[PDB]
Amino acid sequence: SHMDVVIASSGGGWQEAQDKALWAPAAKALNITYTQDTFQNWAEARAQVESGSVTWDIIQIGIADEPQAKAAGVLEKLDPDIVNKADFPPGSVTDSFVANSNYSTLIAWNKKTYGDNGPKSMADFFDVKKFPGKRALWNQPIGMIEAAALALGTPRDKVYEFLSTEEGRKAAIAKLTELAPSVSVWWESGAQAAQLIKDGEVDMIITWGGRVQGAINDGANFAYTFNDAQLGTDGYAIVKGAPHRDAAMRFLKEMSKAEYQKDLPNSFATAPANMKAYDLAKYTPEKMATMASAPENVAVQYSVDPNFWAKHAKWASEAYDNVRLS
Numbered sequence: 001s002h003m004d005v006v007i008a009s010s011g012g013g014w015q016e017a018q019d020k021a022l023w024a025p026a027a028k029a030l031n032i033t034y035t036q037d038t039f040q041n042w043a044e045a046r047a048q049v050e051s052g053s054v055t056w057d058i059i060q061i062g063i064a065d066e067p068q069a070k071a072a073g074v075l076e077k078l079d080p081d082i083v084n085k086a087d088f089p090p091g092s093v094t095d096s097f098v099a100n101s102n103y104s105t106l107i108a109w110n111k112k113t114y115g116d117n118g119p120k121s122m123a124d125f126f127d128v129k130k131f132p133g134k135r136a137l138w139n140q141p142i143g144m145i146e147a148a149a150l151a152l153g154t155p156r157d158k159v160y161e162f163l164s165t166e167e168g169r170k171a172a173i174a175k176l177t178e179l180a181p182s183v184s185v186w187w188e189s190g191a192q193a194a195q196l197i198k199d200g201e202v203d204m205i206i207t208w209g210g211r212v213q214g215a216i217n218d219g220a221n222f223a224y225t226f227n228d229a230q231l232g233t234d235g236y237a238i239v240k241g242a243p244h245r246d247a248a249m250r251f252l253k254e255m256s257k258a259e260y261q262k263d264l265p266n267s268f269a270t271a272p273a274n275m276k277a278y279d280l281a282k283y284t285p286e287k288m289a290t291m292a293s294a295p296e297n298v299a300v301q302y303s304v305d306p307n308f309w310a311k312h313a314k315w316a317s318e319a320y321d322n323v324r325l326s
């Protein structure tokens, strides 16, 4: 669009944090202009590429979206020295993706409904007898299929080993189908999830930690836990055939720097991906406690496996779409 670099993320508090900490200061430093857009699924970028009319330059996607998007020819190969890979978690920087943060897909519950005695595991989240009430789940499968595997009693370190079999994949879908009548909303965006929490419209929800903490900061009577949460990685990629490819490459190089990443958790509960940010910002242990990647929080989580999603995303999207139709 115009001569502006077009950058797209998923709206709300998360997009505002990226804009304030990364996009606006990096564009100012490079004397460049940018336009924001919002989207919820990388398939929208795929639609642009397949139509021959590409308007987006930079897209903010998840680490488990990257293998699928790359295989579909949706992403540009990045310039080899865009970042120093040593400054980022291993595997978080690929030839087509640069991480910007770590986050958790976790359990949050309504304190009006359950008080302090809320679901503290996926087995509890799926237990309608022990915890009666309205559930909310994402309308996309990443973090949801694995939550079902954990609810079936799979150890956190064996999630993907259990999902490697047709039997395990069908059992996780059966477990979601069993829960489906108690699911009152299949939320689509992080801001919609935060609003359900602020309004107390759901009794429990599986959503992103920063969205939950922001809703609690805004007065929501909810609590959450990192136990059984999925440790995710968000980042940037450049759309294949981007109208401002070279400018976008320079913009991505700049915004990935430690001097901008340090400001990312200022007004949104997220964890910068650039390890050098931690030395600059010197976060308080209180601030550290809110971060998905903090050692205390990591111990009770499992990391998303992009290799599982590279193999089974098509099957998972179709089987999960069928669950939500109920």
Ligand SMILES: O=C(O)CC[C@H](NCC(=O)[C@@H](O)[C@H](O)[C@H](O)CO)C(=O)O
Binding pocket: 009, 010, 014, 039, 040, 041, 042, 060, 061, 062, 065, 101, 102, 103, 190, 208, 210, 211, 233, 234, 269, 270, 271
């Ligand atoms: O990294 C963070 O701290 C933010 C976590 C979380 N992001 C999940 C995510 O990748 C979404 O932004 C969208 O599904 C994605 O950008 C659309 O491809 C959120 O929006 O809250």
